[PDB]
């Protein structure tokens, strides 16, 4: 039993909800919140910009030190950093960004990072400003993640569309 509330159960382990991931994280304070990151950990817009703003830019400060030490992530890769005031940890995961010409096949690799954590709050990888089809992202999530994932989807039309089309 966990403290996630109001989710629709799609499969044994995947749940979904229309919610702002920022407001969700502040309420649940999950062990892990997933950020929709880029390889430079520059949290300028989308989920990343929103999560960073909620940390008063502390996420960006920590991220800049991470990059200065380690260099950029790989597309499909991840790193674990602090969750600041939002969660214990933030798993920064880089899905492919279609608006940059990146290979959508890397979306499965991106979701594989979730399997290293027993429970996660997350957005749909490569959705939104990363320019991929969110129905496809949800399908890859369900077919790749085996741990318990609670998906927040900020857009109700999409949320309703995601539910009604789910196979
Ligand atoms: O796939 C990314 C997803 C796209 C869409 F909005 F349509 F759901 N974006 C988000 N999902 C959940 N919380 C969020 N907070 C800020 C942005 C954001
Ligand atoms: Cl977005």
UniProtKB/Swiss-Prot annotation:
Residues 1-167 form the Macro domain. It catalyses: Thiol-dependent hydrolysis of ester, thioester, amide, peptide and isopeptide bonds formed by the C-terminal Gly of ubiquitin (a 76-residue protein attached to proteins as an intracellular targeting signal). Signal peptide: none annotated. It is found in: Host endoplasmic reticulum membrane. It comes from the Viruses. Inhibited in vitro by GRL-0617. It is a multi-pass membrane protein. Responsible for the cleavages located at the N-terminus of the replicase polyprotein. Participates together with nsp4 in the assembly of virally-induced cytoplasmic double-membrane vesicles necessary for viral replication. Antagonizes innate immune induction of type I interferon by blocking the phosphorylation, dimerization and subsequent nuclear translocation of host IRF3. Also prevents host NF-kappa-B signaling. In addition, PL-PRO possesses a deubiquitinating/deISGylating activity and processes both 'Lys-48'- and 'Lys-63'-linked polyubiquitin chains from cellular substrates. May form homohexamers. Interacts with N protein. This is Papain-like protease nsp3. The lineage of its organism: Viruses, Riboviria, Orthornavirae, Pisuviricota, Pisoniviricetes. The gene is rep. The chain holds residues 1025 to 1191 of 7096 of the full protein.
């Amino acid at each position: 039993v966990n403290s996630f509330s109001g989710y629709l159960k799609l499969t044994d382990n995947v749940y979904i909800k229309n919610a702002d991931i920022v407001e969700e994280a502040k309420k649940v304070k999950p062990t892990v919140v997933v950020n929709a990151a880029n390889v430079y950990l520059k949290h300028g817009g989308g989920v990343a910009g929103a999560l960073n703003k909620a940390t008063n830019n502390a996420m960006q400060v920590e991220s800049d030190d991470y990059i200065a030490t380690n260099g950029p992530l790989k597309v499909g890769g991840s790193c674990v950093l602090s969750g600041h005031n939002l969660a214990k940890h933030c798993l920064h995961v880089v899905g492919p960004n279609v608006n940059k010409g990146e290979d959508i096949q890397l979306l499965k690799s991106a979701y594989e990072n979730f399997n290293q954590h027993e429970v996660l709050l997350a957005p749909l990888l490569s959705a939104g400003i990363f320019g991929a089809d969110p129905i496809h992202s949800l399908r890859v999530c369900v077919d790749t993640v085996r741990t318990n994932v609670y998906l927040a989807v900020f857009d109700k039309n999409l949320y309703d569309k995601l539910v009604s089309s789910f196979l």
